[PDB]
Each structure stands twice: as C-alpha cells, then as structure tokens.
Curated annotation (Swiss-Prot), chains A, B:
Its EC number is 1.1.1.1. GO terms for molecular function: all-trans-retinol dehydrogenase (NAD+) activity; zinc ion binding. It comes from Equus caballus. Keywords: Acetylation, Cytoplasm, Metal-binding, NAD, Oxidoreductase, Zinc. Zn(2+) 1 binds at C46, S48, H67, C174. This is Alcohol dehydrogenase E chain.
C-alpha cells in the first residue's frame, strides 16, 4: 500500500542553528538497494541532538536530527537480508558494515562507514531520501529519527525482539548502551574499585549502572545540578558532590576522598575542562579515565603530559564501544530478562508534536530522558 | 677499610644548569638505618641526565646526577635485609617500597616514595649524604650514580646475579627496561601488529626490541637523524622514515603507510608536538599510543579530544611499567639466559673521567649509549 511509493509524513526539520524545530510535512523516498524504510514508534531526546541545534556538534543543515529510537520496518529495498517488513528495529548511528578493518578488529566498533568523522548528512550512497518544501534535507548519522518515517542503510539497522516495548528500548539506541558500555566494556571497571562519574544525565546514570553491575565499591557522582543527585543514588552512586560547593578544584577533592585518586573516572558532560579534571582525579600510576562527552566543534584542550607519564590511561569511545549490530539485539534481550532497568532514565513522555517542549525540558535541567511517541 | 667512615672519592658534580660536569673530590657519608653504600662499577649516559643539565628536567641543584648504573655493595646500614657487602646491585630510580597502594596494585609501578613528582633531591629521610668543597650536594632520583660511591635507600636498590657483567647490565637500570617494558608490558604489543617508534636512541631501540619480541609484523622507526636508521633496522625495524624528507605531516604519512593508522605508537623523544603526532598516527578506533619521552618542564600540549572519543587509548609510563625491585633481578637473569641483547645499544665505552666527552657524543647525535667505567 505504501511499498515502492513516496511517503508524505511529518518530521521535525531543523532549518538553522539555535531555532526551534519545525514540525511540517516531508517527502520520504522509497528505499533503494540495501536500504530499509522504518515507521518510527518512539525516539528519545539525547543531548547530542541538542548539540546539533547549538552548533556544538557540526553536521550539514537543514537536517532531520534524532538518532536514539525504535520503530517497525515498513519496506525493504532490493537485496536486504537482515530485516523484513513488520520487524521491530533500532537504527544504529554507528554502523556495522562487518567488512572494514575496524569491524574485523576484536575491540573496535567505530566502523569506517560512519558519518561522524567527516559528516556528509547523506545515506551511504551520498544522496538524501528527504524533501521538504521541494528542498533536499540532510540526514543525521545515517538515522534521522525525528520523523514519522526514515530510510536507513542496512548496515545501520538491527532487528530486535518482536515483543520489545519500543517506548523503552529506544534508549538502547544510544544513551543506555553508551553509558553502560563505557563502564563495562571500555573502562572494564573491576570489582571493589572506586569510580567517579562526571555528569548525571541519561548517559551518566547509565555509566553508574555499569559501574554497579561491575561491582564497584564506591561510585562518586559529580554534577553542578544537585537536583540530579537523588536519581544517581537510586541507580548506584554512594555519594554525590557538587563542584560549586567546594573552595578547591574538584580533582583535589576527589583525590582526597579516594585516598590518592580513583580507579576509574568518566567524563560524561562534554567540556574540555572536565575532560582534564576527570583524567587528573584518577590515580596517577594505574588510574583509567574515559571520555564520553562530546566536545565543542574543533576546540583543543590543554594538558600536562606528565599526567600520562606517571602511568595513567586515557581513552574515549563512541556508543560504549559496542559493535552496534551485534550488540543491540543482545542488549534488548538482556533488558527483556530484567538484567538492567530503563525506567529510571525516563522522566517525561510527550507526543512527537511537542518535541520543542521536550528540548525545553532538557535545557532547563528538569529532564533526564523525554521519550517522544509518534 | 671504609665501613662506618666517611669516604672521600671522585664524583661528577653539576653546580648549575648548562655547564660541564665538574670532576672533583666529594665526601660520601656512611649509610644510616636501611641505607646502602655502593661502589660504582659502570654507569650509562641517559638523555634524562642531559635533561637536568639543559633545564628540561627540574631537580634541585647542585646535584650528583646519574641513575643508570651497576655496582658492588661496600656497606649496609642497620636493618638492611635485602643486600649484603660484596653483592652486585643496580640502583632503582623508581623505588619499590612494597607497602604503598601503588606497590600493592598488580599493574602500578610508580611507587609513592619516588622523588620524581615533587623532586627533593635527598635521601628518604630528607637529608643528603654528599658534601663537596664544604657544601651539601643533592641526590638525583634517590640514585646519584655519577660518583665512585653513592648511598641509596634500601627500597631503591636490587641485588642481581653475582656473575653479571656490570658494564652491560647497567642498562637494565634504565634505558633497556624502559623501552622494552613500554612495548611488552605497557602497550602489550600483539603478534602481527604494526608499530611506529618515534625516536631511535637507546630507549627507542629498546622499544623496537620489545615490539620484535612481541611478534610485530611491521616496526616503523621515525627519526630526524637518518644516521640512526642502520642500527634501528639491525634490532628489528622494518622501515625508517625521516619527517624532514616529507612535505606532509608525518602522522599523515604513517597513516597512509599503515593503510589507516598503526596498531601501536611510541613517543620516545620528549617533544609535545611528537606526542600529539604519535597519538594521531595510531588507528582512530583501536590504536594505542604510549608516551615515553620526558616533556620540557611545566609545558602543556594541545590536542583535539575527538582523537580519543573515536576509540584511541593514550597512556604513559615510568621505567617501562616494571615494578622495579621485583623486575630488575629477573631482567638480569633473562639477559644471562640470552633472551635479549644489550650490545646493540652500546656504541662507546669510556673511563668515568671522560663524562663530559660522553655527553658531547650524545648531544652531537653520534652515540646511542656511552658506558662510563670507574
Ligand atoms: N561518546 C558517545 O557515543 C556519546 C556521547 N554523548 C554525549 O555525552 C554527554 C552527556 O549526554 P546526556 O547524558 O544525554 O546529557 P545531559 O545534558 O542530560 O547530562 C549532562 C550533565 O552534565 C551536568 N553538567 C553540565 N556542566 C557541568 C559541569 N561543569 N560540571 C559538572 N557537571 C556538569 C549537567 O548538569 C547534566 O546533568 C553529551 O555531551 C553527549 O553529547 C551522548 C551519547 C553518545
Ligand atoms: N619514561 C621513562 O621512564 C624514561 C624516559 N626517558 C626519556 O626518553 C627519551 C629518549 O631517551 P634516549 O633514548 O636516552 O634519548 P636520545 O637522545 O638518545 O634519543 C632521542 C632521539 O630522538 C631523535 N629526535 C629528536 N627530535 C626529533 C624529532 N622532532 N623528530 C623525530 N626524532 C627526533 C633524536 O635524533 C634521537 O635519536 C628522553 O626524553 C628521555 O628523557 C628515558 C628513560 C626513562
Ligand atoms: O549521541 C549520539 N552520538 C554521538 C556520539 C559522539 C559524537 C557525537 C554523536
Ligand atoms: O630516565 C630516567 N628517569 C626519567 C623518568 C621520566 C621522568 C624523568 C626521569
Ligand atoms: Zn545520543
Ligand atoms: Zn565497518
Ligand atoms: Zn634514564
Ligand atoms: Zn611503594
């Protein structure tokens, strides 16, 4: 009934930076070979989407943003073998082509087909499937989930359990998996260790969940918004500290609290200064610090390399280090078996048409994750 | 005829920066409780010693430098249990107290009793055993090996094989162990991998030795002095490149040669720009870069944190990550079992009285390691 045809539907178009999204009609082309067109069911509001609005994260405009979502396949293009119409699916903003040197590496997950390093805002073939007012619109990280329908390349979608609650497991498309994996896969937090988590939004709360799952003895949450502390403690923090409360830099405070520095630290905000602070507060000889937050475009941090020469390890990761298409269905299955919880992250629910109120909630500090329903 | 008495002997005193060493008589006090007085037999000239002369490395002056050495115990103070008069020993510029959180950690080696982070230039008790022309002289990293006799704390000395050739195994006191361990212990180079080594002096050649022992398939040496390339290939480099030969930045050159970035890179020079270059030339999703070189005092580097967010790991280490008193006797035993070679590092052997000529050889680019014999 819609297969092979252009679909007219509503989407949230961003025409320029620092402006509200425009809810209006777009035209969605049918999928070409090895492409999948998806009817969206739920999408979360992640800070990275707000980074597109603010210019923190540069990608070509005008654009349909959104990358944390779940939906149901409407149709598939020629040659698609891994999903079928009617399947529940999660779009993958980090693809898994399975053929490049990173996909073949046992640890790597930043597939070389990604649209992050040199953003084009297109499908893999360099073209767009979206038109609005007769104008071509860019894609975002090959997903573009702020739309009733999107088209993604096959390497950018994973089939998930047919009984999955899509208004919850959309968070496995970004925020939960990023935070959880950053702790259990990237840092490899050890039982009995002391952890420090900078930033207690959706992703930082998920880092805390991973630290707790790994058996950390102490998990210190750090945020300048003390309203975030209650939920952080609910999901596993053993203390929370507000840097604004202290007359000393918080790296000094955390070093004292940990009797010489923490075992594992995580930057989950997106500021150059807290990236250096988080590295400094881990123990100088054997500490590990993981960058998760997204820095402002093209800006360099400044740091003393003696912080590394003493023995520290510094690393970062996209999507918690998970190979995306392998890991997303397994994470959904684990959620179905109650191995981790997603309800603590969901503070607000709104219809898709109220997307701008959802971003207002994020910017005011009141929300963790708002889930939008189509 | 010297136990319990002050010893008058020859040492090389550095009275101020950017001056030749002054070879003259000093007074060496007898060892106090848990101290060891050593008759030096051989000491190598390491670039870190030259860093003290040049002001790159700040430590209190005037000083008896030298930290890469081997000798024979002349006497021990009360309470010493790990060495005896007559023992062959190697001083440890990174102590191993066995009691701090770092010594008890399975990975850490930067013992909290070190004199590197906040240099005092004294014994552990805060005083000096050296006098010259009436004046107290500072120690260097708890070793001070540019002297016919030195006094060290028990936690800064290791007993080694009584049959050890000290004119060779003095290099296990710094240069060899640092480079070798940086490859095999800190980076954990894997079989079949591609490595890039920036800097082909004594430490860089030992990094190559470790990469080869770990089974690397490709080892690219990088140096602006092409005279270093012959020896680098002899000990395992498969290719050598001189950045001055290229119009493009060498991180771009190395990324092309490795078809997308190397598995492991090592900065073994001590320049801020080459630490950032070495990080950039390793593969963005799974590469590992190790800082070995000593940066100029109090200078910060500048880098883009997206280099880490994509998946790179950045780390540094002192003394190759080796727990010093545990590892040095085992490395000596490994050398005696012919498991690695030290002669490729030794280009010059001079009497101690020619220390300044040995430093001229290093600064001119002509030497790798000069061994000074007492
Ligand atoms: N590496 C990856 O793959 C991913 C990176 N991100 C990035 O992670 C970061 C966090 O994302 P969300 O949790 O959704 O954002 P969020 O905005 O909900 O949480 C950020 C938290 O940091 C706090 N904060 C802000 N400035 C602070 C400061 N100077 N000191 C201490 N705390 C401060 C805020 O009060 C807030 O609670 C963002 O930068 C996001 O773009 C998000 C998902 C994937
Ligand atoms: N982390 C640790 O525990 C230790 C650190 N070090 C430091 O390692 C570094 C190397 O030590 P050595 O091998 O003894 O010194 P070295 O002076 O013999 O070797 C340094 C090499 O770097 C080359 N080089 C200089 N500038 C260069 C540039 N822009 N690009 C490419 N190559 C360049 C030089 O030609 C030279 O061959 C020093 O900074 C030393 O202080 C030394 C031992 C222990
Ligand atoms: O939040 C989802 N994706 C992010 C990952 C880090 C770079 C910016 C985009
Ligand atoms: O070369 C020997 N020791 C070095 C170790 C790194 C800091 C300067 C001193
Ligand atoms: Zn996200
Ligand atoms: Zn791939
Ligand atoms: Zn040295
Ligand atoms: Zn110790």
């Amino acid at each position: 009934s819609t297969a092979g045809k252009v679909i007219k539907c509503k989407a949230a178009v961003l025409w320029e930076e620092k402006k509200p999204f425009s809810i209006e009609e777009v035209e969605v082309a049918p999928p070409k070979a090895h492409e999948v067109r998806i009817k969206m069911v739920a999408t979360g509001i992640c800070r990275s989407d707000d980074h597109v609005v603010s210019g923190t994260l540069v990608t070509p405009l005008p654009v349909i943003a959104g990358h944390e979502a779940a939906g149901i396949v409407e149709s598939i293009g020629e040659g698609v073998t891994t999903v079928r119409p009617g399947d529940k699916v999660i779009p993958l903003y980090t693809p898994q082509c399975g053929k490049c040197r990173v996909c073949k590496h046992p640890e790597g997950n930043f597939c070389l087909k990604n649209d992050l390093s040199m953003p084009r805002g297109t499908m893999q073939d360099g073209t767009s499937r979206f038109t609005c007012r007769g104008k071509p619109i860019h894609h975002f990280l090959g997903t573009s989930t702020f739309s009733q329908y999107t088209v993604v390349d096959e390497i950018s979608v994973a089939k998930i359990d047919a009984a999955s609650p899509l208004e919850k497991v959309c968070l496995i498309g970004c925020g939960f998996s990023t935070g959880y994996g950053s702790a259990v896969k990237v840092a490899k937090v050890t039982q009995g260790s002391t952890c420090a988590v900078f930033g207690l939004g959706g992703v930082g709360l998920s880092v805390i969940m991973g630290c707790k799952a790994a058996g950390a003895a102490r998990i210190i949450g750090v945020d300048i918004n003390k309203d975030k502390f209650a939920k952080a403690k609910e999901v596993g923090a053993t203390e929370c500290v507000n840097p604004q409360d202290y007359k000393k830099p918080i790296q000094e405070v955390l070093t004292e609290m940990s009797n010489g520095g923490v075992d594992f630290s995580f930057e989950v905000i997106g500021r150059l200064d807290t990236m250096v602070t988080a590295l400094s507060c881990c123990q100088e000889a054997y500490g590990v610090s993981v960058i998760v937050g997204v820095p402002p475009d093209s800006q360099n941090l400044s740091m003393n390399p003696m912080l590394l020469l003493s023995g520290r390890t510094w690393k970062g990761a996209i999507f918690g280090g998970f190979k995306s298409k392998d890991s997303v269905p397994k994470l959904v299955a684990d959620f179905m078996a109650k191995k981790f919880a997603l309800d603590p992250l969901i503070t607000h629910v709104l219809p898709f048409e109220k997307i701008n109120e959802g971003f207002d909630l994020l910017r005011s500090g009141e929300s963790i994750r708002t889930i939008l329903t189509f």
